[PDB]
Amino acid sequence: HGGNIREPATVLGISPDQLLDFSANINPLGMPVSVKRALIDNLDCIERYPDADYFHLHQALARHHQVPASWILAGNGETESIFTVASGLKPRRAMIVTPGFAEYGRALAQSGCEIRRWSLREADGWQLTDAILEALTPDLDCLFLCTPNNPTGLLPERPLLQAIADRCKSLNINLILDEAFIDFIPHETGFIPALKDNPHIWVLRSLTKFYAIPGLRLGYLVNSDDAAMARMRRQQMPWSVNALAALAGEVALQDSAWQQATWHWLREEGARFYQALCQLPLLTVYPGRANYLLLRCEREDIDLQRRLLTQRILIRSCANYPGLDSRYYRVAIRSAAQNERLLAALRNVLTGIAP
Amino acid sequence: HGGNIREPATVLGISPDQLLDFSANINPLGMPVSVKRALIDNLDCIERYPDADYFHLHQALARHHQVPASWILAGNGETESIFTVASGLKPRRAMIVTPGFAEYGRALAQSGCEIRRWSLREADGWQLTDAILEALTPDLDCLFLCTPNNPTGLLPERPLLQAIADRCKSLNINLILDEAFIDFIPHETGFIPALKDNPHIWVLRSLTKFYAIPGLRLGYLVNSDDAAMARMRRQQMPWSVNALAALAGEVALQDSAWQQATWHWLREEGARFYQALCQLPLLTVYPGRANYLLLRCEREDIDLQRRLLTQRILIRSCANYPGLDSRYYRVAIRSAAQNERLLAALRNVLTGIAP
Numbered sequence: 001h002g003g004n005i006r007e008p009a010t011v012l013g014i015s016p017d018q019l020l021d022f023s024a025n026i027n028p029l030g031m032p033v034s035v036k037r038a039l040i041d042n043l044d045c046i047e048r049y050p051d052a053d054y055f056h057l058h059q060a061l062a063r064h065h066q067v068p069a070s071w072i073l074a075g076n077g078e079t080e081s082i083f084t085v086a087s088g089l090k091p092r093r094a095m096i097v098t099p100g101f102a103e104y105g106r107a108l109a110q111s112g113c114e115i116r117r118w119s120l121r122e123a124d125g126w127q128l129t130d131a132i133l134e135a136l137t138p139d140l141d142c143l144f145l146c147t148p149n150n151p152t153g154l155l156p157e158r159p160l161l162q163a164i165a166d167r168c169k170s171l172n173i174n175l176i177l178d179e180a181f182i183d184f185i186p187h188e189t190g191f192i193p194a195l196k197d198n199p200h201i202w203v204l205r206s207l208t209k210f211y212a213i214p215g216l217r218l219g220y221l222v223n224s225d226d227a228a229m230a231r232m233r234r235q236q237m238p239w240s241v242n243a244l245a246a247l248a249g250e251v252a253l254q255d256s257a258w259q260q261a262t263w264h265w266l267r268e269e270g271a272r273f274y275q276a277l278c279q280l281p282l283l284t285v286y287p288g289r290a291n292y293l294l295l296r297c298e299r300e301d302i303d304l305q306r307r308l309l310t311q312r313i314l315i316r317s318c319a320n321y322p323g324l325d326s327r328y329y330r331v332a333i334r335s336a337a338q339n340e341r342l343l344a345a346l347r348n349v350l351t352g353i354a355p
Numbered sequence: 356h357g358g359n360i361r362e363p364a365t366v367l368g369i370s371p372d373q374l375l376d377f378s379a380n381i382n383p384l385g386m387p388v389s390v391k392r393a394l395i396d397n398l399d400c401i402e403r404y405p406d407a408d409y410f411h412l413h414q415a416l417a418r419h420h421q422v423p424a425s426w427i428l429a430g431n432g433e434t435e436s437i438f439t440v441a442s443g444l445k446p447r448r449a450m451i452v453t454p455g456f457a458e459y460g461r462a463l464a465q466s467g468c469e470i471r472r473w474s475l476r477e478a479d480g481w482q483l484t485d486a487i488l489e490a491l492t493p494d495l496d497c498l499f500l501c502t503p504n505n506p507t508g509l510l511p512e513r514p515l516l517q518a519i520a521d522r523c524k525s526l527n528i529n530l531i532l533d534e535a536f537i538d539f540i541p542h543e544t545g546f547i548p549a550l551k552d553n554p555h556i557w558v559l560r561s562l563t564k565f566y567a568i569p570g571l572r573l574g575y576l577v578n579s580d581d582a583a584m585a586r587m588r589r590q591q592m593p594w595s596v597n598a599l600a601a602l603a604g605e606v607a608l609q610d611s612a613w614q615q616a617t618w619h620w621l622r623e624e625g626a627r628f629y630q631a632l633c634q635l636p637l638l639t640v641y642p643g644r645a646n647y648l649l650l651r652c653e654r655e656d657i658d659l660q661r662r663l664l665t666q667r668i669l670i671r672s673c674a675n676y677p678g679l680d681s682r683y684y685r686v687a688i689r690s691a692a693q694n695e696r697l698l699a700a701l702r703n704v705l706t707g708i709a710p
């Protein structure tokens with residue numbers, strides 16, 4: 001996975017402090033100031049076990065989405081929520097969509113599930129199409145989708161998601177939607193608002209990217225099925241959410257200006273960054289909707305990750321993602337100054353080269 | 356599990372802040388001052404993912420035990436290490452000893468293991484005897500022991516552990532030793548020093564009780580089998596140890612006076628506390644070796660946990676531990692002032708009553 005600055009620094013024989021990381025997609029605003037204050041002023045809570053039931057955290061999450069607290073189960077990162085859903089639903093047959101986030105295949109493999117892959121097509125610009133509907137069959141127990149997709153950044157239109165959601169309902173298939181980056185996309189509500197009466201739908205959320213607290217580990221799962229969620233609480237390990245994460249979560253949801261400030265940055269700097277990248281030669285830039293962009297280098301003989309590492313800039317290589325190949329890379333969208341150094345580095349590598 | 360002050364407070368209709376908790380066994384010294392300083396001064400590390408490989412943390416743990424770093428895998432609390440060992444060894448048949456720590460049975464059940472229970476006997480003062488040796492058979496894949504035992508506090512003599520360890524070696528049985536509280540016991544090294552050449556032995560450790568950081572969640576597993584430990588690293592969820600826990604761990608191991616100060620407190624206040632309890636009527640006190648004591652109320656009609664809750668003091672009831680019954684309770688050993696309030700409360704409940 002990206003963000004492994006320590007391993008990148010190790011390969012170069014330097015300290016991770018000298019790397020400009022564009023392989024992790026963390027909100028460049030940093031952790032909310034209020035979250036930092038709360039952590040410093042409540043550090044002493046570390047001396048006691050967290051609330052095994054996470055009452056305050058879950059109340060805050062439920063207030064935030066205006067749903068019953070019984071529908072929510074926080075996790076030690078959304079990563080834990082992915083393993084919890086896999087172990088709790090224990091599918092016999094499940095479908096994933098590739099290119100996509102690798103942890104689903106890992107969690108499903110560990111739970112002993114037959115995995116079917118629906119392949120996105122380069123000829124479709126990696127866009128999810130309605131062709132997937134016919135591929136859904138009664139023997140499938142679960143379908144997992146990433147909305148928006150990692151690494152492409154594409155967000156399937158609500159009508160298509162709704163049609164898949166309805167076909168899953170009729171074929172008794174659980175639909176798991178990974179909304180890790182949904183809060184970066186202006187005015188996108190995701191599916192939490194539609195879970196009442198759609199107990200086959202599961203939504204995964206993360207505070208990692210959006211609130212810039214990847215090191216604390218906090219995510220959550222939301223679903224309206226009483227029995228299934230009761231099962232999820234038993235399947236999850238006790239005390240798995242640390243006390244500081246739970247405190248951070250509660251405080252972060254209280255920042256009323258945070259989202260607007262992110263949308264504004266993404267609309268301004270994010271758009272300028274995307275435009276600048278599209279101006280580079282030998283580079284296809286896919287229209288990502290959140291804080292990262294999938295790139296395809298048109299010269300297969302150019303190792304963009306290696307070239308940028310010489311400049312101490314780390315990008316994500318998508319060479320090993322099923323469905324992609326070595327021409328594919330992913331870069332975060334960060335601050336203007338940081339984005340400028342990445343552009344300068346790419347620009348020097350890509351300009352002056354024949355097709 | 357104990358330490359659920361929120362749930363206890365909920366049952367009474369009060370705030371957990373008004374309860375004196377003797378149901379969690381946390382070092383009363385609190386978190387090391389150096390750990391608190393380090394956390395405050397490095398809070399910003401939360402903005403990046405932890406090192407997926409935990410190089411610094413594992414180097415510190417390896418330096419501490421003077422063993423190869425390859426033998427260690429930190430966990431999100433020793434609780435995670437218990438689930439990791441269960442899922443990584445995937446035993447078909449395993450033996451546990453009861454009364455004991457409940458998470459082993461839960462982790463084994465989830466991994467689909469046939470569980471055999473070796474029962475400790477009240478007639479033996481709950482002491483582990485050599486009779487267990489004959490109960491070990493070739494069809495067993497694993498044997499799990501708690502050293503010292505939770506909730507009894509008893510530490511099996513090294514010779515008996517060595518004999519069990521050798522019988523497991525000959526019968527190809529993995530021996531897992533839970534040393535969560537071993538550092539509280541003066542001059543007890545545990546088994547880490549003997550793992551070289553004993554790859555069938557696994558040791559679980561926790562920084563939770565000893566360094567008073569239960570809210571941060573940090574424990575670890577140690578074993579000298581190359582392949583098996585490689586498997587454990589794959590079985591464990593990515594980024595499961597949060598960044599602050601990893602930092603705390605490294606700093607805590609640097610406190611050279613911490614252990615002596617704990618042994619001193621335990622030898623002084625701990626002994627005075629144990630003696631005072633033995634003076635109470637209608638109360639059997641087992642000779643615990645760490646920071647907790649198992650109590651047996653001689654009047655079955657006296658609900659000690661309920662009576663103490665009226666005084667806003669929470670103790671652990673061992674009524675639901677397989678092998679024990681409602682006469683059994685467990686109390687932490689804390690500060691002198693705190694211990695005095697517990698004694699006063701017990702003394703008022705127990706004095707003035709006929710046999």
Ligand SMILES: *Cc1c(COP(=O)(O)O)cnc(C)c1O
Pocket residue numbers: 076077078079080101146150178180181205206207208209214217218219
């Ligand atoms: C980053 C990411 C995750 C995991 O997030 P954490 O909360 O840090 O574990 C899950 N899914 C997708 C699609 C992600 O990008």
Ligand SMILES: *Cc1c(COP(=O)(O)O)cnc(C)c1O
Pocket residue numbers: 431432433434435456501505533535536560561562563564569572573574
């Ligand atoms: C407390 C305890 C654990 C778990 O400790 P954490 O590090 O907080 O998960 C495991 N085993 C025993 C015997 C314990 O007492």
